[PDB]
């Protein structure tokens, strides 16, 4: 409404486009949007971080681009978009004629994906995938001190690895370390799920020694199963993420867990003086609260690292990243090895309309033998890049393996992280 | 009729369907159809040569793909595709009750676009671009001796070339020439529309020397104006082609020409025993008759060369090339320099829906301010790689110049053409 008098003082050249948020028309212009023209107030930017990567069950966006709100929302027809725009928005930056001529049509586009990009009221900038790069380093508001960087230990002095992993699951730590070919001397797990500790047991032949829960796990036990080199840990994002229908709170359950990972790091941290080489490594989804994200942030005293998995794999995996292994800031390389499209990860005989699949009305994405189809259990381990049969070992049903699957981190992308280590420790 | 009685008889699993030419359904079957399942006889052969790159002035395909002919067609909707399936086919290929159903969904891709690609009783041949390059080298119905191969000159002994032009148009030769570097020693130049002979005078700075009509010039004319070492010509293509809307004839006209072409050539070619270098370029569209192609390639005693210009500029121009230039089969190579998007042959202010032009409600491409609009003149002079604003001589409409530039070579073609020349002829 004050927003709407704003644009319309703007379009008459009175005032600048870039002088006022677009978003909810506020008067406080800090930063600029990143993908559109226009200011942008810091509530909304916090508001843009929660938001934007929020997907409704439908696959598209929970709510509009533009606001990251809206009431209506107008859902694009482009194939592999998701994104939405609300009528309130699409009223100012196209016009108030012109949002009831493009429902009518049929064949609609968004203005992300329209074939122009350049249009009245609302331009796109010029490049939005580099500034929705550059946005997380923007995040600049929570200021820390950099990750300390120790001196690389020569060739012959390496040994092999002692890793300290919490949330485990499916063991997807370990086996990025065996990918790499680094020498583990033991792999210590905790995780409660009976199916991801059976995974883990089978693929992983009994070289792993499984703990109960995590808040079982005593300082006393940290300090007598050895001093670890690599603290890994993931909290869990089934609850945490807007995917979930049963949203009955957001850090009941996951944030307990986080503590108990934030705990065990410092258990296992080595004292002031002990120079010798420690790692670890903390994860969690991108849709999520900003003040938890400064929480975790805090406690852990790290700026987050966003790293999407779409560089290296065929899913949209945009996950945050806490640590302080040397170059997890360094930009992702995609090998030959790791399938980009989604259509190589198909097994023989199935055909993809998509090229990217995100999995946190089209929601089952093969068209083979003129019938809508899901992703097979194996093909799911394809796109994450688990090696080929990689759940199949007890006789659990589908939906079970297939969320087992869902939940885990995307491998080319841990070992994109991982991958430094071998600098610093033994090698088979 | 007997050809769906065949269809019905194959789907029985009673005949397959690549013993049967799925175009009419002849039993005489030697070729298999290059896009999809079938086979091809050779009455549907030519029929493919002459209908496949034929369009109507709405831009999409003159008839149908599968069998050239068909009643009613059925025009797809994606996006750069102009490809046309009439009703008939899709009764057999898709099934009797499809077709309809397919009418009345209205975002409607074709079958060599369609996303999944393989449908029941029609799937589409996985390396069709190949086989449409290789179906081009499949005409050895005109079987020939190959052009004679001459040593290369040394380069000390080099000369300037001479060029007999016929059909000079805008000297897109010359401009080519001096382009690669070569030192021309003359360039004679028969033309009789003034605005072509206009452009060639200014562009190339009275340079050329400028005859009247073809069928005036004797052979005595082309004993006293020097030995020539290069004679290029490309017959009329606005009779020739199906784009003009009056088709009176096929061959009145333009075939004539061609004939005046074959002469000169004859007039300008030394005698057996004279082994200097001696080369011809003639060229013809595609969108031609097969006899015609035939009395063509037995006139000039040689094999076509297929050339479609997309595979090096930003526009559809698929010509034939006869000739014995060394290197005229060799595969195109685009140079940074040539423009394989539209939009970068876009003026500044203007963006494109199209990634190619072809031009021999979307008849005009380019999206500018929310308004549809035609190419301007010094884009269409960008598009086909002739210098910026090459035709801009003398006070002409934009209609006549449009038409000036439309008949032109497509200009990195003619320097992939007339590149291996530098090896025979002295340079700059
Ligand atoms: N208290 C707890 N202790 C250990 N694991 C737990 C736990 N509560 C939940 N989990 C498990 O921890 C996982 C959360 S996220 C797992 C991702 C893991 N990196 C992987 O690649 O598999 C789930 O498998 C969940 O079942
Ligand atoms: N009898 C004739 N003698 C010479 N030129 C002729 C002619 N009849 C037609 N022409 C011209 O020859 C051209 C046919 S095609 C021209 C293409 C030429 N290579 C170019 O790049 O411009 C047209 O410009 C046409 O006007
Ligand atoms: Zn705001
Ligand atoms: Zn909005
Ligand atoms: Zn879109
Ligand atoms: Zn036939
Ligand atoms: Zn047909
Ligand atoms: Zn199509």
Same mark, same amino acid.
């Given at each position: 409404?004050?927003?709407?008098?704003?644009?319309?003082?703007?379009?008459?050249?009175?005032?600048?486009?870039?002088?006022?948020?677009?978003?909810?028309?506020?008067?406080?212009?800090?930063?600029?949007?990143?993908?559109?023209?226009?200011?942008?107030?810091?509530?909304?930017?916090?508001?843009?971080?929660?938001?934007?990567?929020?997907?409704?069950?439908?696959?598209?966006?929970?709510?509009?681009?533009?606001?990251?709100?809206?009431?209506?929302?107008?859902?694009?027809?482009?194939?592999?978009?998701?994104?939405?725009?609300?009528?309130?928005?699409?009223?100012?930056?196209?016009?108030?004629?012109?949002?009831?001529?493009?429902?009518?049509?049929?064949?609609?586009?968004?203005?992300?994906?329209?074939?122009?990009?350049?249009?009245?009221?609302?331009?796109?900038?010029?490049?939005?995938?580099?500034?929705?790069?550059?946005?997380?380093?923007?995040?600049?508001?929570?200021?820390?001190?950099?990750?300390?960087?120790?001196?690389?230990?020569?060739?012959?002095?390496?040994?092999?690895?002692?890793?300290?992993?919490?949330?485990?699951?499916?063991?997807?730590?370990?086996?990025?370390?065996?990918?790499?070919?680094?020498?583990?001397?033991?792999?210590?797990?905790?995780?409660?799920?009976?199916?991801?500790?059976?995974?883990?047991?089978?693929?992983?032949?009994?070289?792993?020694?499984?703990?109960?829960?995590?808040?079982?796990?005593?300082?006393?036990?940290?300090?007598?199963?050895?001093?670890?080199?690599?603290?890994?840990?993931?909290?869990?994002?089934?609850?945490?993420?807007?995917?979930?229908?049963?949203?009955?709170?957001?850090?009941?359950?996951?944030?307990?867990?986080?503590?108990?990972?934030?705990?065990?790091?410092?258990?296992?941290?080595?004292?002031?003086?002990?120079?010798?080489?420690?790692?670890?490594?903390?994860?969690?989804?991108?849709?999520?609260?900003?003040?938890?994200?400064?929480?975790?942030?805090?406690?852990?005293?790290?700026?987050?690292?966003?790293?999407?998995?779409?560089?290296?794999?065929?899913?949209?995996?945009?996950?945050?990243?806490?640590?302080?292994?040397?170059?997890?800031?360094?930009?992702?390389?995609?090998?030959? =090895?790791? #399938?980009?499209?989604?259509?190589? &990860?198909? $097994?023989?005989? !199935?055909?993809?309309? @998509?090229?990217?699949?995100? +999995?946190?009305?089209?929601?089952?994405?093969?068209?083979? =033998?003129? #019938?809508?189809?899901?992703?097979? &259990?194996? $093909?799911?381990? !394809?796109?994450?890049? @688990?090696?080929?049969?990689? +759940?199949?070992?007890?006789?659990?049903?589908?939906?079970?393996?297939?969320?087992?699957?869902?939940?885990?981190?995307?491998?080319?992308?841990?070992?994109?992280? @991982?991958?430094?280590?071998?600098?610093?420790?033994?090698?088979?």
């Amino acid at each position: 409404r004050t927003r709407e008098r704003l644009v319309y003082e703007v379009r008459q050249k009175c005032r600048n486009i870039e002088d006022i948020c677009i978003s909810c028309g506020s008067l406080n212009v800090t930063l600029e949007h990143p993908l559109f023209v226009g200011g942008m107030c810091q509530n909304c930017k916090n508001c843009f971080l929660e938001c934007a990567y929020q997907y409704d069950d439908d696959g598209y966006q929970s709510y509009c681009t533009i606001c990251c709100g809206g009431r209506e929302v107008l859902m694009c027809g482009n194939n592999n978009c998701c994104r939405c725009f609300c009528v309130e928005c699409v009223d100012l930056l196209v016009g108030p004629g012109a949002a009831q001529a493009a429902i009518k049509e049929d064949p609609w586009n968004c203005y992300m994906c329209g074939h122009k990009g350049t249009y009245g009221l609302l331009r796109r900038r010029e490049d939005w995938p580099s500034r929705l790069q550059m946005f997380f380093a923007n995040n600049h508001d929570q200021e820390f001190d950099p990750p300390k960087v120790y001196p690389p230990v020569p060739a012959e002095k390496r040994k092999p690895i002692r890793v300290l992993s919490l949330f485990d699951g499916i063991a997807t730590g370990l086996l990025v370390l065996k990918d790499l070919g680094i020498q583990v001397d033991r792999y210590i797990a905790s995780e409660v799920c009976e199916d991801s500790i059976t995974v883990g047991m089978v693929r992983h032949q009994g070289k792993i020694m499984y703990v109960g829960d995590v808040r079982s796990v005593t300082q006393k036990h940290i300090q007598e199963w050895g001093p670890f080199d690599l603290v890994i840990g993931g909290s869990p994002c089934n609850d945490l993420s807007i995917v979930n229908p049963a949203r009955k709170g957001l850090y009941e359950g996951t944030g307990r867990l986080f503590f108990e990972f934030y705990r065990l790091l410092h258990d296992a941290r080595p004292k002031e003086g002990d120079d010798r080489p420690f790692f670890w490594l903390f994860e969690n989804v991108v849709a999520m609260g900003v003040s938890d994200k400064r929480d975790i942030s805090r406690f852990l005293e790290s700026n987050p690292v966003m790293i999407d998995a779409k560089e290296v794999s065929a899913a949209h995996r945009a996950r945050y990243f806490w640590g302080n292994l040397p170059g997890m800031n360094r930009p992702l390389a995609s090998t030959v =090895n790791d #399938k980009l499209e989604l259509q190589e &990860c198909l $097994e023989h005989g !199935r055909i993809a309309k @998509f090229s990217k699949v995100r +999995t946190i009305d089209q929601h089952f994405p093969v068209f083979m =033998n003129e #019938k809508e189809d899901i992703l097979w &259990c194996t $093909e799911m381990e !394809r796109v994450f890049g @688990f090696p080929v049969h990689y +759940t199949d070992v007890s006789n659990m049903s589908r939906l079970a393996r297939q969320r087992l699957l869902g939940r885990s981190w995307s491998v080319p992308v841990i070992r994109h992280l @991982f991958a430094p280590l071998k600098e610093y420790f033994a090698c088979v």
